[PDB]
Design a protein around this ligand. Structure first.
Ligand SMILES: [K+]
Ligand SMILES: [K+]
Ligand SMILES: [K+]
Ligand SMILES: [K+]
Ligand SMILES: [K+]
Ligand SMILES: [K+]
Ligand SMILES: [K+]
Ligand SMILES: [K+]
Ligand SMILES: [K+]
Ligand SMILES: [K+]
Ligand SMILES: [K+]
Ligand SMILES: [K+]
Ligand SMILES: [K+]
Ligand SMILES: [K+]
Ligand SMILES: [K+]
Ligand SMILES: [K+]
Ligand SMILES: [Mg+2]
Ligand SMILES: [Mg+2]
Ligand SMILES: [Mg+2]
Ligand SMILES: [Mg+2]
Ligand SMILES: [Mg+2]
Ligand SMILES: [Mg+2]
Ligand SMILES: [Mg+2]
Ligand SMILES: [Mg+2]
Ligand SMILES: [Mg+2]
Ligand SMILES: [Mg+2]
Ligand SMILES: [Mg+2]
Ligand SMILES: [Mg+2]
Ligand SMILES: [Mg+2]
Ligand SMILES: [Mg+2]
Ligand SMILES: [Mg+2]
Ligand SMILES: [Mg+2]
Ligand SMILES: [Mg+2]
Ligand SMILES: [Mg+2]
Ligand SMILES: [Mg+2]
Ligand SMILES: [Mg+2]
Ligand SMILES: [Mg+2]
Ligand SMILES: [Mg+2]
Ligand SMILES: [Mg+2]
Ligand SMILES: [Mg+2]
Ligand SMILES: [Mg+2]
Ligand SMILES: [Mg+2]
Ligand SMILES: [Mg+2]
Lengths: 26, 75, 100, 101, 177
RNA sequence: GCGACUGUUUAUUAAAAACACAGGACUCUGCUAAGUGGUAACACGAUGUAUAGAGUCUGACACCUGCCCGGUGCUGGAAAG
RNA sequence: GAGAGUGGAAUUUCGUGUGGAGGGGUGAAAUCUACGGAUCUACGAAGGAACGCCAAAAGCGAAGGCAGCUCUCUGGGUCUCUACCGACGCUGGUGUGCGAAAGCAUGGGGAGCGAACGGGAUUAGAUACCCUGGUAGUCCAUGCCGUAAACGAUGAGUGUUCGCCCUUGGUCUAUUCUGAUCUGGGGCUCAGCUAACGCGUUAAACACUCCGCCUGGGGAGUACGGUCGCAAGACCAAAA
């Protein structure tokens, strides 16, 4: 798995961590 | 490391002090002193690169020594 | 006074005690490696280590657990091969019978 | 086990203080069922740096060695030498098969 | 019976020093630097006063100089104490006393503690914090700090000028020592 | 919805969401302690000693508690004036 | 590996002499700090953390990992034997344990460093990169968590396969300087293998045993559910 393919997972994980800290904090 | 000056000769004493700096290994340790923190993960990479340049220098010295020794012997 | 056991380290005392245990359990006179001899020596080592080892010392506890599992394997060998020595070891060392 | 007790005294300590400390450690070894095989003096030694104490800084010292056959617990039981004012340093090592001259 | 006991510790004493005679008392000038102590006298022969509560201890910082020793108290203050004053080696017992916690109001009443009413819950005739309709701290943007029932502040490092004068005198006398 | 809970309260129109509470935090106190009452002596604190005493606010527990010291207070500071 | 002791260098802070104008920092500056006397220089004190040289393709450990020195207790490994024993072995679903760092809980500690944050700059802007302060944290004790590019991106084991150069730790033979045989660790290579790069007796070769895992990309390591966790979250893990 190259860095270019790792970047797609990186962005999916960042957006999910953001959504989980915004939604599940409430 | 302290060096006496004999007969007011500063350059001779400075040459002696430089030689004792170099041959005691203290100059190598002073040059290796760092100004920032280096992680162990970066020390590993630096050691790998230093070993690679040592391998290349040893190979080059071996080729020059083989050429010079084979030429000087008169064959 | 020089040869008193108070002047001996714990490792030397373990060596003397294990030689005594091995003398107690041997099948032949030069026997030092039969299964019941190994079981008795392992039982003595296991009992010493379960008392002297510190809780934070995980690296030695892994070796103690290895001694436990080795003793299980040797007892399993003796239960199917030499039933008399199996009963001898379980009675004299106070071990349970776990054929399961 | 067999041990070497190294004792580096302060250079100002007299003969009687050296004898008093060596005899106190010796009576401590006897009370724990031990044998003293050897006691020797290396005289006055020069130190590699200046050992700094509450008295000041010392560049000399008197070196003693007691060889004992004693209990394994004796290095722990000798920790009162860490609070001893006649001493610069002390060290207990397992006895080695080396000629010290 | 008793001679065996006084002889058993004589073979203990010659391989032992101050830092493990736990429970024993001697003057501070007979002790060493860094000795952990408690039950310190203020005046010689009067009795122990200073380090007494459960788990507490003090530490000797300096040797007797001009007949006095420097000691670090449990509060973090340092004081020069007369070298002839006595102290006990070690720490005070029951060190887990400060972490035990109650679970109900009745346990406080068993100790003899009666309930405490907040000043803001009272009337102006009762407390300086009393008064107001609804919940109110009875001051505002041009009031003062939180105060006692007797009007003295109890925040921001306040202390009375008498206390400041006495502590400054003590500090100035101890600076020359 | 409010209060965590058992309790307490306007004797004689209000029993509650109010008070208290266990828990939390801040400030002061080196012992002739601070603090409180008294002109004072003195007493309480306490035959206690910072794991203790006092004052204040908050109020089980769980997760948390962001910015501001300009203002009112409290507080530290070598000098000059 | 765990426990108990102990050492010095350097950084920071503080003190005392001497001394007087800056220091610090940048691409350039400024904040900061300094005439209440700094930086600098000598001596001293306190404290925490990490252990220079040795020193590295070395060593040890199942892996994660492990560096000053002494002692205690302790796990594993190697060699030799005309010693014992007699197939007692390998792998391993479900399970159990160990498991960087960050994080969490309680109590300590806090030099240096430093998420957050304050200020000084740069810039069109600069929620950054640079500078200056700096909290949590980093350290200790006891518990929790259970994840990493946890990588040799190479599961564990067994048998076999031309050599050369080094090296760790032994043993034997030596014939004065080396050979032999085990043991791990490296470099190169005949073959053979490979999509290619390359691997090559520590295989990615010639064969085999047992386990785990894959079946176009995206959606997605997401949704749902269960279990575990104080939380943070973790594991198993789809479909349209
Ligand atoms: K990624
Ligand atoms: K109250
Ligand atoms: K009010
Ligand atoms: K009234
Ligand atoms: K009110
Ligand atoms: K009202
Ligand atoms: K609530
Ligand atoms: K009611
Ligand atoms: K009420
Ligand atoms: K303000
Ligand atoms: K203000
Ligand atoms: K190894
Ligand atoms: K091993
Ligand atoms: K080795
Ligand atoms: K190659
Ligand atoms: K092989
Ligand atoms: Mg892949
Ligand atoms: Mg009211
Ligand atoms: Mg009023
Ligand atoms: Mg209102
Ligand atoms: Mg409504
Ligand atoms: Mg209620
Ligand atoms: Mg009821
Ligand atoms: Mg009720
Ligand atoms: Mg009524
Ligand atoms: Mg009514
Ligand atoms: Mg309370
Ligand atoms: Mg009283
Ligand atoms: Mg309230
Ligand atoms: Mg707030
Ligand atoms: Mg961590
Ligand atoms: Mg903490
Ligand atoms: Mg900014
Ligand atoms: Mg910065
Ligand atoms: Mg900083
Ligand atoms: Mg994973
Ligand atoms: Mg790794
Ligand atoms: Mg060899
Ligand atoms: Mg090899
Ligand atoms: Mg392949
Ligand atoms: Mg497997
Ligand atoms: Mg995940
Ligand atoms: Mg779920």
């Amino acid at each position: 798995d190259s860095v270019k393919k790792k970047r797609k997972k990186k962005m999916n994980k960042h957006k999910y961590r953001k959504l989980r800290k915004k939604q599940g904090r409430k | 490391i302290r060096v006496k000056v004999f007969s007011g000769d500063l350059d001779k004493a400075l040459t002696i002090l430089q030689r004792k700096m170099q041959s005691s290994g203290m100059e190598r340790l002073i040059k290796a002193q760092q100004t920032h923190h280096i992680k162990n993960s970066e020390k590993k990479v630096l050691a790998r690169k230093n070993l690679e340049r040592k391998i290349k220098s040893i190979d080059f010295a071996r080729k020059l020594q083989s050429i010079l020794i084979k030429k000087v012997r008169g064959l | 006074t020089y040869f008193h056991p108070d002047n001996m380290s714990s490792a030397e005392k373990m060596k003397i005690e294990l030689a005594k245990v091995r003398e107690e359990f041997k099948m032949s006179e030069s026997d030092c490696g039969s299964a019941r001899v190994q079981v008795a020596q392992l039982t003595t080592k296991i009992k010493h280590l379960s008392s002297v080892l510190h809780k934070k010392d995980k690296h030695s506890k892994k070796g103690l657990i290895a001694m436990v599992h080795r003793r299980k394997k040797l007892l399993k060998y003796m239960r199917r091969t030499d039933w008399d020595s199996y009963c001898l070891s379980l009675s004299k060392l106070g071990l349970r019978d776990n054929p399961d | 086990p067999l041990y070497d007790c190294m004792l580096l005294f302060k250079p100002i300590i007299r003969k009687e203080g050296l004898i008093d400390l060596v005899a106190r450690i010796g009576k401590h070894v006897y009370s724990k069922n031990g044998v003293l095989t050897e006691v020797k003096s290396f005289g006055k030694v020069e130190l590699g740096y200046g050992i700094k104490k509450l008295d000041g800084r010392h560049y000399q010292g008197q070196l003693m060695q007691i060889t004992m056959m004693a209990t394994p617990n004796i290095n722990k039981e000798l920790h009162y030498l860490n609070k001893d004012d006649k001493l610069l340093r002390w060290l207990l090592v397992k006895h080695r098969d080396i000629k010290i001259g | 019976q008793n001679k065996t006991l006084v002889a058993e510790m004589e073979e203990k004493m010659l391989h032992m020093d101050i830092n493990s005679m736990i429970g024993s008392s001697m003057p501070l000038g007979m002790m060493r630097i860094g000795t952990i102590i408690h039950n310190i006298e203020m005046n010689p022969g009067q009795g122990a006063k200073l380090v007494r509560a459960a788990g507490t201890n003090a530490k000797i910082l300096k040797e007797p100089a001009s007949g006095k020793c420097l000691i670090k108290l449990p509060s973090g203050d340092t004081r020069w104490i007369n070298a002839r004053c006595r102290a006990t080696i070690g720490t005070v017992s029951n060190p887990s006393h400060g972490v035990k916690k109650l679970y109900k109001a009745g346990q406080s009443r068993w100790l003899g503690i009666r309930p405490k009413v907040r000043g803001v819950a009272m009337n102006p005739c009762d407390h300086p914090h009393g008064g107001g309709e609804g919940k109110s701290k009875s001051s505002g943007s041009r009031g003062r700090t939180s105060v006692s029932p007797w009007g003295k502040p109890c925040k921001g490092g306040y202390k009375s000028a008498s206390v400041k004068k006495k502590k400054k005198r003590l500090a100035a006398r101890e600076a020359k020592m």
